[PDB]
Design a protein around this ligand. Structure first.
Ligand SMILES: [Ca+2]
Length: 747
C-alpha cells in the first residue's frame, strides 16, 4: 500500500516565491516548479540560470511559526513587516545532519506555503522513491541534464562532460555516432535529446561484455534472442529465493511472463514472435521486477505488539554537540536533525542558572563550550518528534540543577510545551507493580517518556547526578534509571520498569564475563549503553557488540559517520524508518536459551549459507582512478568476517570488470541478525559508496545494487552488479577465549 511519488497538480505548474538570502541581504523573484516525475525542485533565478535542488536530499521543510525569521532590518523593510507570518517556508537540505544549507522562500500569494511545504516533505521522505530501481536513477540523471539549460535555452556540452568525467574522447565519439553536436558549446536543442537517444548514447558509451557472458550462460548458445521457456527458466531457476514457500510465493507462469517481453523489448519484430534481445534483457535486469530487496522489507510489517524490551531502539548520545567533546559548539539544530533522521532516545545535560535572570542551559560539563537554553531545545523536540515516525520518543535527562526553584521551572516547561503527548499518568492495563511487563510501542503511539531519577572517572560527568525533587519526579513513570548491583539480585526483584545505564568498558566487562545472564536480563528490562569518556574526538564503538546480547538503547555519536554510524543508520532504515526493530525469537521468549558465543548451529534456529560474487560496476567516479570493492558481514562473533576484498582495477572507473572466486560465508548461525555490507573505494581510500543489506531478506541471482553515500542518501549514477546465492544450511583461559572471539568484531 506504499504509494509511488505523485506530484500534485499545483506543483507541476508552479507558483511564485520571493527567495531572500540573509547573507547577501537581497531580493529576487523566482518561480518554483517540481518536474513531473518528482526528482528535482528547480527555479529560474536572477542570473538566468536554472538552479536545481535534488529532492531526495531534503532533510526538512518547515513553515509557519517554525520557519526562519529575518533578523536584518532592511530586509524586513523590503518584505514589509499577522498574515505575513504564514507566507514563509524554509527548506533544509544537506549530505549529513551537521553540514546543512538553508533555502528561504517567501510566498507572494495567500496560503500556498502550507501546501508547498507539505507536498515537498511528502515527496522527500518517500520510501519507494529512495529504494528505486536502476532505470529510475538513469532517468533521474537524464532529467537533471534536461533541466539545467543555459541563457539561450539549450544544453551545453560541458554538462555532459562534467557528468561522465572519467573520460573525454568516448563522449564526443558517441555523440558523433548518435548524431549530436560535439563542440565547445554546440547549443544542443532539447528536441533532439529525447530519452531513446540518451539510451543509445549510453549503450554506445559503455560496452557490456558481462551481460554477454550472462546471455552465454543462461542457455542462449544460439545468438540472437531468448524464448519463453528460457527466460522463464532463468527467472525460476536463478532469481528464486529457496527459503520461502512454494504455495505462498508461486512460481512464474508464461501467461505472466509475456508481459515482461511486451513491457521491456524495444524491437517490434522480436515481440510478435515473443522473444527478448540483448537490448531488452539489459533493460530487464534493472527494472521494478528484479530488485535487490523485496518490498515487504521496508513496509511497516513488523509485529508492533510485543513489549518495549524486545526492540532495538535507535538512540544518540550527547545530541547537542556538533564536534569533539572538549571544545565543541552546542547547537539546537542537531536535535531536529536527530529526531527527523529516526533517533528515538536523545540526551539533555541540564545546568543551573545565573543570579540576575533564571534559566537552565544545556552544555557539556565544564569543558568550555557554548550554551543553548533549555526552552528552545524542548520546543525543537516538541516540533520534530513525530514528523517522520509516530512512535514513542524517550527523553533522557542527565540532571545537574540543584536549586529546586529552577527544577520546578524545568518541570513546568516540560508540561507546558508538550501537552497531551507527555506521559503524565500511568496506563490502565499496565500498572507499576512487580510482575507486569512494559507497554508496547503500539500502545504508546505519539507519547513522550522521560528518564530521570525518581524518589566515574571513565563514565564522564554522568556519575555526579543530583537527587530528585517531588515536582520533577512525578513525570518519571515507566523508564526510571537505577544503579546496577547484580543480575540475580535484579532478577529476583522482578520489577520490569527499572533500567540501568552502563558505560562502554563496564558493558564490555559484563559481556565478556557472563553473557547468558546478560541476555536473560535483556528479555524483560531496558538497558542503555553510552561510549566512554576517553573518546574526546567523538569516536564510536561497534554497536553490534551489544546488539548481540539484546541491549535495546545502544547510544552512538551522530556527529561523525564512521563504520559504526554507517551500520546504525543503514540497519535502522528498514521497518519504515520507524526506529524500532524486532529482536529474533530466541532472545525474547523466556523458555528458550542460547549462548551468544556459540560456534555450532543452535537448535530451533534455521541457519543460512550465503555466497557473494562481484561482477562489475558502472560510473563509479569522475576521474581516471582504480576501484576496489569490499564485502563485510556483521553479526554474531562466529559470523563476523570482515577481511574480504577484490583486486584493484587498473584505470576503470567507468566500467570495471572483476573476475575471481566468490566470497563464502558458509555457516551463518543466527541469520536474522547478520547485515551484509558492500562498499566501494577508490585507490588509496577515497570513499565512493556503500549499501547495507540484511541477510534475512536478500534475493538471489544477478542484481543491481545502487550505492549510497555516508549518511545513507541515494547516489544517482554509481551502481555495482553482484550475484548472490542464499540457501538453507545442509550439514556435511576463558577470558582470553572471549577476547579472541571479540577481536574481529571490535577491530
Ligand atoms: Ca551526557
Amino acid at each position: 500500500q506504499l504509494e509511488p511519488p505523485t506530484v500534485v497538480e499545483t506543483l507541476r505548474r508552479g507558483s511564485k516565491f520571493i527567495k531572500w538570502d540573509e547573507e547577501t541581504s537581497s531580493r529576487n523573484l523566482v518561480t518554483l516548479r517540481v518536474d513531473p516525475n518528482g526528482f528535482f525542485l528547480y527555479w529560474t533565478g536572477p542570473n538566468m540560470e536554472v538552479d536545481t535542488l535534488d529532492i531526495s536530499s531534503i532533510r526538512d521543510t518547515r513553515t509557519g511559526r517554525y520557519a526562519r525569521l529575518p533578523k536584518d532590518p532592511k530586509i524586513r523593510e523590503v518584505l514589509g513587516f499577522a498574515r505575513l507570518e504564514e507566507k514563509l517556508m524554509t527548506v533544509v537540505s544537506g549530505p549529513d545532519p551537521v553540514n546543512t544549507v538553508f533555502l528561504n522562500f517567501m510566498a507572494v500569494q495567500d496560503d500556498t506555503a502550507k501546501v508547498w511545504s507539505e507536498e515537498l516533505f511528502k515527496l522527500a521522505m518517500n520510501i519507494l522513491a529512495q529504494n528505486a530501481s536502476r532505470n529510475t536513477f538513469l532517468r533521474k540523471a537524464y532529467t537533471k541534464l534536461k533541466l539545467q539549460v543555459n541563457q539561450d535555452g539549450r544544453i551545453p556540452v560541458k554538462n555532459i562532460l562534467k557528468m561522465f568525467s572519467a573520460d573525454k574522447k568516448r563522449v564526443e565519439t558517441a555523440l558523433e555516432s548518435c548524431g549530436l553536436k560535439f563542440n565547445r558549446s554546440e547549443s544542443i536543442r532539447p528536441d533532439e535529446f529525447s530519452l531513446e537517444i540518451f539510451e543509445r548514447f549510453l549503450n554506445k558509451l559503455c560496452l557490456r561484455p558481462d551481460i554477454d557472458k550472462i546471455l552465454l550462460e543462461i542457455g542462449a548458445k544460439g545468438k540472437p534472442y531468448l524464448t519463453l521457456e528460457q527466460l522463464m527458466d532463468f527467472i525460476n531457476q536463478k532469481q528464486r529465493d529457496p527459503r520461502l514457500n512454494e504455495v505462498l510465493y508461486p512460481p512464474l507462469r508464461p501467461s505472466q511472463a509475456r508481459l515482461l517481453i511486451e513491457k521491456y523489448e524495444p524491437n517490434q519484430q522480436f515481440l510478435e514472435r515473443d522473444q527478448m534481445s540483448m537490448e531488452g534483457f539489459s533493460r530487464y535486469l534493472g527494472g521494478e521486477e528484479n530488485g535487490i530487496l523485496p518490498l515487504e522489507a521496508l513496509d511497516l510489517s513488523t509485529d508492533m505488539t510485543q513489549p518495549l524490551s524486545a526492540y532495538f531502539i535507535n538512540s544518540s548520545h550527547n545530541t547537542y554537540l556538533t564536534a569533539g567533546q572538549l571544545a565543541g559548539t552546542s547547537s539546537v539544530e542537531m536535535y531536529r536533525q536527530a529526531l527527523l533522521w529516526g533517533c528515538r532516545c536523545v540526551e539533555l545535560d541540564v545546568w543551573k542558572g545565573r543570579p540576575p535572570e533564571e534559566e537552565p542551559f544545556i552544555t557539556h560539563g565544564f569543558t568550555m563550550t557554548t550554551e543553548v537554553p533549555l526552552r528552545d531545545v524542548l520546543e525543537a523536540i516538541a516540533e520534530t518528534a513525530f514528523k517522520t515516525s509516530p512512535y514513542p520518543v524517550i527523553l533522557s535527562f542527565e540532571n545537574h540543577v540543584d536549586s529546586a526553584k529552577q527544577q520546578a521551572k524545568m518541570a513546568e516547561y516540560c508540561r507546558s510545551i508538550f501537552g497531551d503527548a507527555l506521559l503524565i499518568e500511568p496506563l490502565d492495563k499496565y500498572p507499576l507493580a512487580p510482575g507486569v511487563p512494559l507497554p508496547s510501542p503500539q500502545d504508546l503511539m505519539g507519547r513522550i517518556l522521560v528518564k530521570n531519577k525518581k524518589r566515574t572517572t571513565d563514565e564522564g560527568t554522568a556519575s555526579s547526578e543530583v537527587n530528585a525533587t517531588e515536582e520533577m519526579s512525578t513525570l518519571v513513570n515507566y523508564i526510571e534509571p537505577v544503579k546496577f548491583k547484580s543480575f540475580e539480585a535484579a532478577r529476583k526483584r522482578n520489577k520490569c520498569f527499572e533500567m540501568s545505564s552502563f558505560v562502554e568498558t563496564k558493558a564490555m566487562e559484563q559481556l565478556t564475563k557472563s553473557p547468558m545472564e546478560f541476555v536473560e536480563y535483556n528479555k524483560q528490562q531496558l538497558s542503555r549503553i553510552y561510549p566512554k569518556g576517553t573518546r574526546v574526538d567523538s569516536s564510536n564503538y561497534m554497536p553490534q557488540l551489544f546488539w548481540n546480547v539484546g541491549c535495546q538503547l545502544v547510544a552512538l555519536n551522530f556527529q561523525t559517520l564512521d563504520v559504526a554510524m554507517q551500520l546504525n543508520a543503514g540497519v535502522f532504515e528498514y521497518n519504515g524508518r520507524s526506529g524500532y526493530l524486532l529482536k529474533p525469537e530466541f532472545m525474547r521468549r523466556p523458555d528458550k536459551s542460547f549462548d551468544p558465543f556459540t560456534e555450532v548451529i543452535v537448535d530451533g534456529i534455521v541457519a543460512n549459507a550465503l555466497r557473494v560474487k562481484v561482477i562489475s560496476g558502472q560510473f563509479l567516479s569522475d576521474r581516471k582512478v582504480g576501484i576496489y570493492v569490499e564485502v563485510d558481514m556483521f553479526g554474531l562473533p562466529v559470523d563476523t568476517r570482515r577481511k574480504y576484498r577484490t583486486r584493484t582495477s587498473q584505470g576503470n572507473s567507468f566500467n570495471p570488470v572483476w573476475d575471481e572466486e566468490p566470497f563464502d560465508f558458509p555457516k551463518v548461525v543466527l541469520p536474522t541478525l547478520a547485515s551484509l555490507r558492500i562498499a566501494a573505494f577508490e585507490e588509496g581510500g577515497k570513499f565512493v559508496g556503500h549499501r547495507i543489506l540484511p541477510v534475512s531478506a536478500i534475493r538471489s541471482g544477478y542484481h543491481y545494487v545502487c550505492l549510497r553515500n555516508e549518511a545513507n542518501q541515494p547516489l544517482c549514477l554509481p551502481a555495482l552488479l553482484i550475484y548472490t546465492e542464499a540457501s538453507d544450511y545442509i550439514p556435511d583461559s576463558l577470558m582470553d577465549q572471549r577476547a579472541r572471539q571479540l577481536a574481529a568484531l571490535i577491530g
